[PDB]
Amino acid sequence: KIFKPEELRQALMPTLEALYRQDPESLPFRQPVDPQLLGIPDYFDIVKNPMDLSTIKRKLDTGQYQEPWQYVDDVWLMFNNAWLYNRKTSRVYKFCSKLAEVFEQEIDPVMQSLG
Ligand SMILES: C[C@@H]1CC(=O)Nc2cc3cc(c2N1)CCCCCN1CCCc2ccc(cc21)OCCCNC3=O
């Protein structure tokens, strides 16, 4: 089973758009982490493989995933990074949890269709 880039975009982009549509919860995740602007100078001591919504969107837009699981792995990498770095009481951690709840609901039927 070979997945063409347009077929992956058609199936998976709606699940990424669902996360962008969470406002304000997607705001911390819409651009690559910049620790100087965000005031978190130790970030890359903790997080070695950063990921954000715009990077995932570019990969889908340009055909960089060969298989649906690679896209799923990048979304969970984004979430796991934020749960790793942020305190459980923090706004970013709580926003991360809301996006993960949305993602689980949207991705389940789509992965069933691609499986
Ligand atoms: C996902 C990415 C990296 C991560 O994992 N955690 C952190 C930790 C932090 C921030 C983010 C993230 N988001 C990004 C947050 C969105 C708002 C940015 N901005 C725009 C609106 C006003 C304001 C005030 C204080 C501030 C950022 C901002 O920052 C204060 C210092 C501590 N700053 C974090 O504690």
Side-chain angles (χ1 to χ4, degrees):
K1 217 298 152 172
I2 301 294
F3 291 96
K4 293 199 308 298
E6 183 57 29
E7 168 187 22
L8 289 180
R9 266 188 303 278
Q10 289 216 288
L12 300 172
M13 188 62 85
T15 71
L16 193 69
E17 294 194 351
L19 304 183
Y20 273 95
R21 289 198 308 267
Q22 304 310 305
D23 193 322
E25 291 93 346
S26 68
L27 278 42
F29 305 97
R30 281 186 183 192
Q31 56 284 132
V33 177
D34 179 327
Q36 196 273 329
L37 294 176
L38 305 180
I40 49 175
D42 67 329
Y43 181 80
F44 290 129
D45 302 347
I46 307 294
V47 173
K48 298 307 181 172
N49 291 88
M51 188 53 53
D52 73 283
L53 290 176
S54 78
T55 294
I56 300 164
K57 193 168 63 180
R58 182 175 90 254
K59 287 172 80 164
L60 274 174
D61 279 336
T62 60
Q64 300 185 35
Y65 302 114
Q66 301 90 51
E67 313 278 352
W69 63 265
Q70 295 169 322
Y71 160 79
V72 175
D73 279 357
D74 270 351
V75 175
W76 284 109
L77 167 64
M78 183 180 59
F79 296 151
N80 287 330
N81 282 343
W83 288 319
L84 173 57
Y85 181 75
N86 298 280
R87 292 175 185 195
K88 310 179 82 164
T89 54
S90 72
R91 169 169 280 182
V92 172
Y93 188 111
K94 290 180 184 308
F95 284 7
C96 180
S97 292
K98 167 79 192 315
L99 304 179
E101 292 190 16
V102 172
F103 188 62
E104 293 220 77
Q105 292 188 15
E106 300 278 21
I107 192 64
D108 199 14
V110 175
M111 289 296 279
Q112 285 187 180
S113 80
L114 298 170

